[PDB]
Amino acid sequence: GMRGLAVFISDIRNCKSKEAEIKRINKELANIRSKFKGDKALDGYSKKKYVCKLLFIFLLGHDIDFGHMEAVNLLSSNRYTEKQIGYLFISVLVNSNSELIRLINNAIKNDLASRNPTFMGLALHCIANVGSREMAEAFAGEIPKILVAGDTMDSVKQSAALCLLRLYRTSPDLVPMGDWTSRVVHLLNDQHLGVVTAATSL
Amino acid sequence: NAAMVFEFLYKMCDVMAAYFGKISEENIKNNFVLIYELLDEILDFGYPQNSETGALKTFITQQGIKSQ
Amino acid sequence: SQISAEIELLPTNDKKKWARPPISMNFEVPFAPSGLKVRYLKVFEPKLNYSDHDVIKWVRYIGRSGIYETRC
Amino acid sequence: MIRFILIQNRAGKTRLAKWYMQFDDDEKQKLIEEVHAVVTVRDAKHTNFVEFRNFKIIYRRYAGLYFCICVDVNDNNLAYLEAIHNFVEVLNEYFHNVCELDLVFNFYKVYTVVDEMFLAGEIRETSQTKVLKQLLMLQSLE
Known part of the structure; x- marks a missing residue:
């Protein structure tokens, strides 16, 4: 469980007119800025709490322009929850940067070189929920490599089908038609039923 | 008569201001019956009858809700 | 805060x-x-008839320093 | 395809904004405001399939929430309404009760449920028991 979010949102909800809310949110932003700069904030859980608080600050209706490198740093972790929060933050906040996009692509490429459905599914959701030219360029030939008749679980198969759908919807010219059509077509006859749903959509 | 409608609207605005202060969503919502009674009394069949405060007080028995 | 200055002096007379x-x-x-x-x-x-609390108010203080002289 | 999913309230606050296509900065707020204005006026004795601009939304009331999926013109109507109901029932059996407080205090869990059953603009999964099993199996693992 997480303790900082409960108290933070509880405080910010039962607030007065926008003046008090703005004062509280700016105080929290200053506190999180001080915590991010220096100090012994190497613990992953503290970064989790700060990133979640900042995400709620953004979703409340205020603009956020910092706390992005320290948030994409969460991806390189073994804890599932940290990866989930990092992927959610990347999906919610999108910025056009050279080093940041390259780092995100490297993290996702490392993620896809795994052997568990959870990490692959999270990476696929991160790819498909935003969409970008860089993601399509660096993963045009990787999603079909998942969808091809390899030893993959059903959930990652559905995720890959929908991710390829999204990439084709956003990057039509970057999707080939190699020797995987004969696999996707026969994938529609596969067992399970959600897999048939994703294959039918694609 | 074009000016008569505007004059009647101004008189109704003054009556509402004297009754429950400034016109707001909450004041209108909380005083539906008062508003219906006021429109029934001040106006009938389209003839804007007298809207004097003394004359309107006798014909109106509803009291509005005030929220400051 | 502490500052220590060593100032060399010319010979001079008086x-x-x-x-x-x-x-x-x-x-x-x-x-x-x-x-x-x-x-x-x-x-x-x-x-x-708008609420007073709905008015956004910002108050900040900036105290400038004039002639702040200490004899030495 | 699904354009966006919203979980609004009676007042107008957006408890979950999930867009599946690139909108502008003020365009999102304008869309939310006009969707709220369209939905709030209607009542139970009305069609749930209200169209606006070049799209159509599928609004469904639940306690104090207005679930709304905006689909394309040619997309089916009833299927996405029942997808909304399925999503609501998965939330109901997940939190053991759906309410604004749980959505506010557990926004990331709501996001992961939405991405579990609504991915890339289409319907990722159509079942409740299997989604719940896969989510519980991915909840004890930390």
């Missing part, structure tokens, strides 16, 4: 004495030196 000018400092602080503090600021409008 009557210099450095004239002992005062110590001058420049600063600004986020509070009123006179102690003035805003207690309340309410805006009431009878016609429009």
